[PDB]
């Protein structure tokens, strides 16, 4: 019963976690666009990578 | 003074020179202020295409 309670919930938990990883990747890619354009410096681009990791 | 007297001048021909030297200074100031905000507008136009 504990194994089935884990199986029924870890699907939604992993779906939420990999959607969080995808949103952090999109945020980092927008910060990389702002760095390549010229608006932001390297300190903020490096700050986004730590949240991604 | 840049014209021969008693002659026929055209529309827009330069007649004198009134020693700019100050209008040159504030023209340089306005140009320097333009040259940063122009680059900022050109950068924000490239950034707004995908909502950065």
UniProtKB/Swiss-Prot annotation, chain A:
Deletion phenotype: Disruption of MexA, MexB and OprM significantly reduces active efflux of N-(3-oxododecanoyl) homoserine lactone/3-oxo-C12-HSL/PAI-1, but not N-butyryl homoserine lactone/C4-HSL/PAI-2.
Subcellular location: Cell outer membrane
Induction text: By growth under severe iron limitation.
Subunit composition and interactions: Component of the MexAB-OprM multidrug efflux complex, composed of six MexA subunits forming a hexameric tube, binding to a MexB trimer, which interact with the trimeric OprM outer membrane channel protein. The OprM homotrimer forms a 135 Angstroms-long pore. It consists of a beta-barrel, which is probably inserted in the outer membrane, and an alpha-barrel formed by alpha-helices which probably spans the periplasm. In the ground state the periplasmic end is closed, while the outer membrane end opening is 6-8 Angstroms in diameter.
Family: Belongs to the outer membrane factor (OMF) (TC 1.B.17) family.
Function: The outer membrane component of the MexAB-OprM efflux system that confers multidrug resistance. Functions as the major efflux pump for n-hexane and p-xylene efflux. Has been shown in one study to be involved in the active efflux of the autoinducer N-(3-oxododecanoyl) homoserine lactone, thereby playing an indirect role in quorum-sensing; but has been shown in another study not to be involved in efflux of this autoinducer. Over-expression of the pump increases antibiotic and solvent efflux capacities.
Protein name: Outer membrane protein OprM
């Amino acid at each position: 019963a504990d194994g089935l309670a884990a199986r029924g919930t870890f699907t939604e938990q992993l779906q939420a976690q990999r959607d969080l990883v995808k949103a952090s990747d999109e945020y980092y890619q927008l910060a990389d666009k702002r760095y390549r354009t010229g608006v932001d410096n390297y300190l903020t681009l490096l700050d986004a990578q730590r949240s991604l990791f | 003074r840049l014209f021969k007297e008693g002659s026929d001048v055209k529309a827009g021909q330069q007649l004198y020179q009134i020693d700019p030297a100050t209008y040159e200074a504030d023209y340089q100031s306005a140009q320097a202020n333009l040259a940063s905000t122009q680059e900022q507008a050109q950068r924000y136009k490239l950034l707004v295409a995908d909502q950065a």
